Design a protein around this ligand. Structure first.
Ligand code: MG
Length: 225
């Protein structure tokens, strides 16, 4: 059972290749997760140079298997149940009045390391919109991820709205539609409706000259008593 793999600290690797309006870039992340406390600490680096989109727009793309599921909800934790073989996460992120990202990620163990391999494609971004114009503040509001089972696909879907803060006090909405499907043939947990409550703190490494993002995230399952 998948959850047995998460009782202690697990190293995480994230590798993203992206193309947004033809701007190609890559991000490499390292860090660790402790699902006991729903805690992620990660540092992401753009290995191709300057990130052509704001870091906060990549937070959701850049391992919900590290959510803390309260014991009374453990039968609803799809993500860990899919491990170690993993799951494929597909998202469409629709930025209101602007372009969209489509992402595909394979999340699985490689040895004792949890790896998230991602391809991101962004299209129809406006040149001086909030994304390609870099008008988003370097922060991240707390939000819920709402999960529902997709039993015909042996997986789950999530929907949620991210509100990115624009530097002028306004909000850039990013609608997220997500589907997750197991990679392996083992049984997985198909949950009741519930949500993940998440909080993310973005920061910088003061010794780091590369374009990068330090992230501290807490994710807790809720919505079932
Ligand atoms: Mg403000």
């Amino acid at each position: 059972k998948g959850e047995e793999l998460f009782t202690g600290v697990v190293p995480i690797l994230v590798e993203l290749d992206g193309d947004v309006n033809g701007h190609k870039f890559s991000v490499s992340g390292e860090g660790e997760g402790d699902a006991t406390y729903g805690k992620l600490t990660l540092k992401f680096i753009c290995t191709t140079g300057k990130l052509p989109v704001p870091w906060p727009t990549l937070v959701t793309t850049l391992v919900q298997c590290f959510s803390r599921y309260p014991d009374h909800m453990k039968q609803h934790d799809f993500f860990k149940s899919a491990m170690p073989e993993g799951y494929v996460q597909e998202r469409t992120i629709s930025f209101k009045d602007d372009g969209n990202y489509k992402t595909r990620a394979e999340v699985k163990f490689e040895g004792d390391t949890l790896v998230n391999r991602i391809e991101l494609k962004g299209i129809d971004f406006k040149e001086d919109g909030n994304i390609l114009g870099h008008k988003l503040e370097y922060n991240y509001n707390s939000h819920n991820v709402y999960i529902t089972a997709d039993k015909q696909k042996n997986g789950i879907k999530a929907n949620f709205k991210i509100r990115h803060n624009i530097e002028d006090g306004s909000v850039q909405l990013a609608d997220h539609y997500e589907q997750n499907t197991p990679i392996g043939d083992g049984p997985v947990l198909l949950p009741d409706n519930h949500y993940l409550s998440t909080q993310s703190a973005l920061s910088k490494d003061p010794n780091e000259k590369r374009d990068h993002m330090v992230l501290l995230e807490f994710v807790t399952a809720a919505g079932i008593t």
